[model samples]
Target chain A: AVADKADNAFMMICTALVLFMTIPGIALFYGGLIRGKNVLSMLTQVTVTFALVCILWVVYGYSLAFGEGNNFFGNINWLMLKNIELTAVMGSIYQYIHVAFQGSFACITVGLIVGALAERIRFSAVLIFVVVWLTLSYIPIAHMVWGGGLLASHGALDFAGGTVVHINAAIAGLVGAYLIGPHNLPMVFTGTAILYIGWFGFNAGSAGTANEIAALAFVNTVVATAAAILGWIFGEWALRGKPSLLGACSGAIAGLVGVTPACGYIGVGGALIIGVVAGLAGLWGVTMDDPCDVFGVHGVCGIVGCIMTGIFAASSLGGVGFAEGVTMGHQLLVQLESIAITIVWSGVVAFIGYKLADLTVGLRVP
Target chain B: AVADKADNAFMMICTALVLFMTIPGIALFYGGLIRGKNVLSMLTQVTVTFALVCILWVVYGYSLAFGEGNNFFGNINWLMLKNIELTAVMGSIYQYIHVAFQGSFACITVGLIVGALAERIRFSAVLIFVVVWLTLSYIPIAHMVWGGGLLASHGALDFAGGTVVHINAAIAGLVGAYLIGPHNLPMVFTGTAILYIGWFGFNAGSAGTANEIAALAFVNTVVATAAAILGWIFGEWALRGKPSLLGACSGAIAGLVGVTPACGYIGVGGALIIGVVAGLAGLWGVTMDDPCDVFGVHGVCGIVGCIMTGIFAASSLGGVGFAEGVTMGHQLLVQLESIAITIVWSGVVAFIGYKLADLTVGLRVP
Candidate 1:
């Protein structure tokens, strides 16, 4: 069929929404958190990195991750979008739109890591780290999950990038934060709010159309996010004297992250359960005292979502149902394997990324 | 035939994008404009009014503006979304999505007015103003332009919301500013940046699909905004000592507001022209010392855009052709009529809204 006009429009808007998450969203969030002296420099770093990512995606990133290749990575035949027709369809929309949408995901992944480390990291070091990690780690992992790579070949489900986006970026952020040290709380809340708002694009846009699945995902996003806010606030109110805005914002992110892999696959009931679980898990994960809580909110919740997707995806749990003949236990095992591989893969790449930056431009700000 | 899934997806995302405009976009813009002491209170007011508008829309706003009725307003049959099937098709998408999209426009309009006034006005007073103004001014004008009432029937061309949104709120903001007083400049820049980004949805999504027209709108939005920024900077650099971030941000809004009525109807060439004109007019409009420059960027540029859209929308100007038998001259007249009606309607209602607030809780802060 001719590419649906509606789908093309939807995808383009979604791409813009995702990009919004980076430019002012994450930047503002991080800016508010950092001390006044560091805010300008951090914002400048974010803007420059965003531009670099856009350029890299157009030049080779799209081809390496999305073009045909083996499981580990893709070929570079479509470099600079050389051979793709403007009208060429990818799924139900134009191929150009797919490039932009996927490219947006790449920008946000870099933004998540960059925002966390900007306060302490040298700007040049952060750029160099982005180049290395995006090429070596983010590209290959994205290819594996979404581009018919190792994980997809094994029938792993990581919808809207619980594995590729959240866990992958979270792990890299954790490594960078470990090397860089602590940062702001309020800024994290602002970024969380922007992420929460932009996430409608992140989650619902994954459906690739405006069908019942998209509607389901949209409703699920709202329900899960609201549920997570309450869940986190309730936990905080009980444990601490009063619930705070930071807690409320964190809860929102936890719900958003937890529901990422399951938004389209699960029902509203499943979404709410996953949100509450993700919220509580986030609170628990933060107890370890890692700065910015990338590990706590994204990494831990990513793991939880990936695992829960295995269970809730069963028709018995009101999900779209497990792929034919795959038992819940078997699916859960696959999910675990996928999660383990991602953690190891992202961890190793992040360490190398940081070390390369350390050797080259120097990692820390003077 | 069933609804187009792609369009439904596009409209839904666009709706979220527009809502993003108010929740954080306009709120942040206003927050930056106000003094630190008033910022927190202003934000709270914006949030509460936002909730109020959402509730009112569900209860009666949607029905009064979008449902079947006379030339001034819609019938009450759709109150609380009554009798509307989830799967019901409107244009190319589901009716539910249409409801959400229209509701978002209302929210942004209210935010525009409330944000500018929040600094000086009492919280209860602002709420009072919003309720009266939204019900009286916004609903009927929206019906006339979009819901096939007076202006729409007269063949006025407002591709997005030059009339319903920018001009409507700008005039109201001007009235409130005159009543309230001046605030900050740097904060306005921040809010302007946000509005510029969120406007991609506000303009392109107006096409109600992801097709070529939407693409044109999206591209035009970028081009016009950039052109307007340069245009404003050039004028500022010439007249004033140097260009500033605040000037650049204002230019972006000027271009966005100018392009609003023309994005879908005009080509890139026309878009750039409208943007430059709007930018200069904005610089000129602020001569009266209106704080926040809502009247300058929105009011003046809105009138400029509404009129220019009448000309640029002609096929000769590379726009979508006018309705059969309608000449450019005739279209221009219709545009003026529409603009005039919106100005008078909004002014009168705004005056009344403020007066009502004054009678009750009082307009100014204690």
Candidate 2:
């Protein structure tokens, strides 16, 4: 019933880590991959949208996503964080930290979509789409997973934000790539490296406390990422005759996405297995090409991660095991249902949001 | 003593944050500022030496610097992190986490020097110098400040590593600049932004726990950095026709360095005052030629921060106050003595390191 100083400190630092990923992490990452002339414009979009999400999260995003309303969305009772006391506790840390941590997730999720926007999307339209999608899609799914809604209630496992962040944003980015069009390798290397580093906080910090579970998640993240990097490089070398830095970096990210949901639930062996599968899966997905490979890496690997969580979480497979009376077959079904719901929900909302922007202010640069 | 899960989680994540600053952080920072042809070369140096330091730190560096021994250095009793059990506690967390966290500081200290090396220093020469300087300068100073050695015994107040990490590294970088010579704006923008964000871990994590003290340090860092940015912008605007992104970025680093030593002890007001002074001092120091301005932002502000820590740690000025029976005047003198000691030790070691590198490998590219 009391806050732990250790947890407080852990979450605060994790919050900072998550924020670090979005700013220079995503900015430089996408910047290096795009045409030189568009890098500045892309950076501006990332920074401005980052600020926008921060403000929105504090205002009503937190309330609707985490305010304890219903299965789909929370109430707006805590808008501007007015009702929550400064001393209020969430789990073992302060509610304020939870707000910021949760808010960082929102910020980076939008940043993921921005990577796919390319030079085609209008900056103002990007803003409109974000406000709508964050409210209609991101907030609702966040509620459904972390805020005691449908997925959580059904005992669906998503250790981090496999469905909420990676999948949700990936689908949106894929949709926008269809609407917008196309998009650096050393810069790509830098960005990929930064993202992999920052994902430690993303996966481990999802534990919501400083405990053995967090340690497991952290180790799993490390092992999975390493395995994925090797897996991607091996596949790329085989297919292309020589492995590229771009291949290695993308594999690192693919490994990261694949392990997001499983990091907290799986063993090292399972992490190694999942990472290899995700790496191969990610490489195959990118062959279809939605600008930035947001879908290929995040969307495909996120789905792989969610499905793998069900398989690996059994004690028979070296996981912490499922809850009492929950069988593997039942859990597998739950994961599938949750993934389908996320893809459909995010896809519809993204389409509508883009169209709304199209009708109101048009889509591409004026 | 039992390890707290919270502290374990905190330090592991903090370790990640500190590492994040070096890889893409420092690499991008110094990379953007140098000649375009040298960017890839600089990135290679950052990556290679980064691997080099990680290996050294784990192999023997941690044991010699952190093991129980004399005031200047520890015994090599825990080489390869042997002797200590996996579960051994360092304060409230696993000793392994502390080793990694402390090792990250060593990693970035070398990183700061890499920034000043630019294109002048040979790859092999850079490695040679790092081995000498890190052993003679960084490890010994780290032992002194945090490992219960000279400065800690003398009751010096360095909340973070004003004397150990920043001042020590800054002096080394300045000497290298003299021997080596020379060095981006948007890339600089990304690097500076990342550094400011990563510094949250450096300052607040110095508390060695997540508590009210950590909170105070966190707040102080935020306020000081914001204030320094405005101060530097104002100064630049007054002198030049308009303010620039480089000015803002440098100011951000200036503010971060200024508040480093004082973060855990000072009030917000003191933090604000220190930030402004450090930012202006940094701007003035850069008027002199030194590649990368390592001495300017880090060294100049490191001195200011250590000195300011003495005056602002008084109960009279809204700080946490000095130790029992520790007068402000006496504390202030200890700080100056400590600063002078750090300056002399690092400067001498750096000179030897550069000379050794020159004699062995010939300093410049062949």
Candidate 3:
């Protein structure tokens, strides 16, 4: 079938949105969190790494993860996008747009990890780490979850990368942060604000079209994010006597993370609930000084969202419906399995990535 | 018939991209340009005005610009989105998406004006000005160009929003800046970068689908923008003896604005030529004491682009070609008339808006 023009347009815009999350979005967010002296360095590192990722994606990243292969990863037949016609359809959209859109996801996931660690890491070391991790970790995991790999074959319901992006990147971030040590927050609020807005593309675009599912995801993203912001603020006010701008921003991210897995599947009510829970969980997880709270918000909220999707995706809960004959209990087990695999896979790969970087270029700032 | 899911997805993402332009894009750009003492206030004003415009767009703005009506404006039949089915299709996408997309244009237009004048103008006065000018100037201009009104019926070509967005907002901003006076320039660079990135949606998404035109716009946007950046930097290098970050950023805006009306209509060659001319023209326009260069970049580039579209949009020049039975000279005349109408309409409305604000809340700080 021919690619739909509407879907093509939608995916292209969504691709831009996902790219937006990195370029200035994560860069500004993390830049604001670090000390002023290192802000420029952080932004420069981000720009360079961002460019690196885009280059890598076009070169082999898209092909490895998305090409037809086994459960672990795809074939390299499409290296340099050799075999794919620009006019070829991927699902309902053009192949080229799908490549761009999927490539954007890889960029943001890398950005989330790099932003959390950029302040202290060596620039070259970070790039090396990205190349290694994106190849071994991001690619295989993306294949397993999204490219009809193991988790997807098992009917794991990750709508927009709770396992593939949030959990995966967050675990890697936690490992890297632990290995590197700590940093400092500006413009954090502004970056957070942009991410909040751009997430419509992140979440809804995952629907891959502009159907009721996309619309549902769109509205759900808005409602869930709003709820999470309020929930985070309320929790902050109760716990700390005042809500900081950082706190508000953190809440927004929490809600966004929480809804990623369920935005399309669930109703507005489910989104609100997921947002509130994710906000509270994120607030609690931040007790430890995880720089930029990557693990705290993305990790904890990703877990919460993954679990909630198991419940919310049932017909009784106003979701689209569960896979045929699949019970909520069974789905819950699958969700847990998916999360466990992601955590372990990401944690192990991230440790290897950091260790490799340390041995090669030295991870810490000179 | 149901809205095309693909187009629906595309337009929704496009809408979000447009919104991204205002939230952190323009806010950060303008915030960095103003004095440190007034930066927070400027951000607040942008945020509040952004929300206000959003609410207003929903209340009656969309109706007055999109609802079926005569040449001047749309009727109020769609007030609060009444009489519009969620399932209804507009063009190839959902009407809801169209409403959101059109509303986003209004928000950015207001942001362009507010970002320029926020530092010196009273907050209340800015709000009053936005309300008045949006209703009086923006709505009518949008209708004339996009909503099957006079200009659109006359076969005037605006691929995106040169006349409606760039020219219209530039005039209002220039008027306000003239009345208000000067401000400061860090953050402006950051904001400019964000605008440059988000403009992909502004230009390509104007195709209203994910097709060859959008693809052309996308590539043209990249090429034109790159050329314009080089063009402006070369000019700055020549004239100013040193090219600064501000100059590079300003050059980017010049190229982006210059290509707005032509990106989808013209080919890569035309885009490059238009971009170079726009960038050089923008650098020249800034010779006067207009702070933020609303007139310099947006105004000057918008005019350059509008006129260039007349020349480049012919089949001979690799554009989509003029409407049937229309001569190149005729198209040029139509483009000029559109530009002239927009300038005069926006200028008169802006004067009234400022005067009314002066009468009520006083336009200045103290």
What is the TM-score of each predicted model, taking all chains together?
0.66, 0.64, 0.66
Calculate DockQ per candidate and list them: 0.16, 0.18, 0.19
Give the alpha carbon lDDT tens digit for every residue of A1-366 in model 3: 798776777677777878878877888888888777888888888888888888898899888899889998998888899989877888988888988899889988998988888888999899989988898899999999999999999999999999999999998998898899813333776877678776888898898887867876875676577567667767877988755557767887998999999998886568778978888888988864476789899999999999999999887776778999899999999999999999999889889989999999899989
Residue A225, candidate 3: C-alpha displacement in angstroms: 5.8
lDDT of each: 0.83, 0.84, 0.84
Model 3 sits at a Cα RMSD from the real structure of: 7.3
**How well is each residue in A37-116 modelled by candidate 1, as lDDT tens digits?**
88889888889988998999989999999998999999889889989988889998999999999999999988888877
- Candidate ranking under DockQ, highest first, comes to 3, 2, 1
Clashing pairs in 1: A6-B6, A6-B7, A7-B6, A9-B210, A33-A187, A210-B5, B29-B191, B32-B187
lDDT of 3 by residue, B137-206 (tens): 9999999999999999999888889999999999998888777761445667767777877788788789
Model 2 residue B14 CA deviation in Å:
4.7
Q: Could you give the CAPRI-style class of model 3?
A: incorrect
Candidate 1 vs candidate 3: the DockQ winner is: 3
Q: State each model's C-alpha RMSD to the native.
A: 7.2, 7.5, 7.3
What is the model-wide C-alpha lDDT for candidate 3?
A: 0.84
The fnat of each candidate, in order, is 0.24, 0.33, 0.33
